[PDB]
């Protein structure tokens, strides 16, 4: 959480 | 008492590439690749369940007002 997770 | 274990295993290396540009200066090794051993997950829990991007953003939003 996509910033990457 | 913990005792770290270090090692190295070699594996087949990069294949020879087909028709490279002659104008190219860098090249890639075809020698074996060294695979060095780091800690297993049992020895080293790399998880971090403390990370909470959504709550952080919320406080940050407020901080940028303060």
């Amino acid at each position: 959480x996509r910033x990457x997770x | 008492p913990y005792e770290p274990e270090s090692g190295c295993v070699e594996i087949p290396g990069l294949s020879e590439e087909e028709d490279p540009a002659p104008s190219r200066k860098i090249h890639f090794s075809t020698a074996p690749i060294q695979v060095f051993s780091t800690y297993s997950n049992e020895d080293y829990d790399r998880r971090n369940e403390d990370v909470d991007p959504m709550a952080a953003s919320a406080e940050y939003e407020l901080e940028k007002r303060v």
């Binding site: - | 200066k25 060294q34 695979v35 060095f36 780091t38």
Partner: protein, 294 residues
Amino acid sequence: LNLDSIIGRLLEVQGSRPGKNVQLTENEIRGLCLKSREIFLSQPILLELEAPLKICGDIHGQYYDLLRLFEYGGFPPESNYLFLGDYVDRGKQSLETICLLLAYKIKYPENFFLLRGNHECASINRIYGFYDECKRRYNIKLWKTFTDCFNCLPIAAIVDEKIFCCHGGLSPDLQSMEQIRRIMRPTDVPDQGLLCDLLWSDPDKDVQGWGENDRGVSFTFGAEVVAKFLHKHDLDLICRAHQVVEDGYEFFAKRQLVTLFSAPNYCGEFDNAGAMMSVDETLMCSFQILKPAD
């Protein structure tokens, strides 16, 4: 600023159960940030480097993997190093990681180099772990001091006029290396533009040209972008990081681009190896892998 003592305390845990903290003093860490900022600002924003060099990808606070990387690659100054960014966040030991890397920068400023990653940015590391770690272990003022330091990191390197290195990738706006060299520091990372792209973009096999990036920022670029860029600037290779890759390294556009990633079993969610790329005096490139034991 007692550098040797600080480095000594950071390395003391080398034989320990991974996870053990090294708690430096607030003044030691502030001295590391201030001294390293003077060094970064005295060197160019686009580094001009020469082989031999070992190039490393993301670390993300995985302090004990960083120690193994040095154990196997050679502790400074036995080898020369270029890291491509993303030292902090995700991991539980961002502080020890960045502190050791700044110590080595200050100790060997012509043999050790750190590029800026997208996580060396306050709006990112505020939310992905680093602020929290600073707040817990020190105070939030320490976190602002790190921001001052990070805002001065160089953003790209060229190795022997042939390997272009940056954290993320290419930018549709990048036409001349003068566009990088004219960037003034300290600077934040903007939401768009050249500096953003360099730290955020990704290569994509499915795109012809520039595409939208699933990260919600910057772009993807295809293999023809890489070819054009390389031909234009008489370069041989792009070396970048930013994406987890199974083997620790992964080629793109034939062997015109390589992604490097140096955090093994990345934040305990992947089973990837880490890798570093060595470049020798003859410009021979090779890979060293760091793989978690079974």
